[PDB]
Amino acid sequence: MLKAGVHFGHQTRYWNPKMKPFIFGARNKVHIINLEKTVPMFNEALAELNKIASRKGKILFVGTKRAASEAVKDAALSCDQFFVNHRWLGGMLTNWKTVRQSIKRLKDLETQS
RNA sequence: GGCUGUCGUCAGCUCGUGUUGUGAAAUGUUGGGUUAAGUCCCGCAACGAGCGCAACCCUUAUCCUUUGUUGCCAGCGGUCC
Numbered sequence: 122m123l124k125a126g127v128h129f130g131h132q133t134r135y136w137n138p139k140m141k142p143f144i145f146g147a148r149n150k151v152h153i154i155n156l157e158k159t160v161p162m163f164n165e166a167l168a169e170l171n172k173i174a175s176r177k178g179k180i181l182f183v184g185t186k187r188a189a190s191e192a193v194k195d196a197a198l199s200c201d202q203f204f205v206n207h208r209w210l211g212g213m214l215t216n217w218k219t220v221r222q223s224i225k226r227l228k229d230l231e232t233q234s
Numbered sequence: 235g236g237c238u239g240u241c242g243u244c245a246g247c248u249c250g251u252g253u254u255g256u257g258a259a260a261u262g263u264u265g266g267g268u269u270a271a272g273u274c275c276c277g278c279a280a281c282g283a284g285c286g287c288a289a290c291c292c293u294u295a296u297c298c299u300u301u302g303u304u305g306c307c308a309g310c311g312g313u314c315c
């Protein structure tokens with residue numbers, strides 16, 4: 122029917138009660154999201170995301186999780202956007218005004234070697 | 235006032251921004267290694283920075299350059315030696 126063979130679920134008994142209205146089933150202790158009803162969500166964050174993206178807005182991807190770090194840098198910066206696949210950093214957005222220094226440093230430094 | 239002793243030549247002491255907490259405060263600055271060292275790296279709701287330790291000052295250990303007088307005396311002779 123749908124491309125579900127590319128996955129099956131994850132987790133087990135740690136989960137979090139916050140998720141319940143969407144449970145495809147339960148096996149091997151690992152819970153399985155009810156993609157059968159997740160269909161709307163599978164596009165929801167895309168539709169209302171289109172107007173934003175199509176509006177040509179700065180893209181902010183985050184893949185600090187080593188389990189897919191570099192495996193996303195491409196689909197991000199290399200994809201004409203931004204990212205942070207490596208290791209996230211505190212204050213990057215909040216203490217932004219401060220991080221600028223460090224950021225502006227990796228630039229004016231490239232001219233080194 | 236200015237000056238100085240004192241721990242202490244100790245590696246400490248802080249601050250701005252962000253964030254957590256009602257608040258007093260905390261974080262950083264804690265931690266894993268490492269160093270003479272807040273030394274360096276790694277990690278981290280922290281990001282950075284200021285005073286301080288590490289440098290430049292002196293001086294000694296070498297080698298060269300030049301300058302050779304009052305300093306020097308090797309090859310040359312002289313020589314009251």
Ligand SMILES: [Mg+2]
Pocket residue numbers: 272
């Ligand atoms: Mg230091």
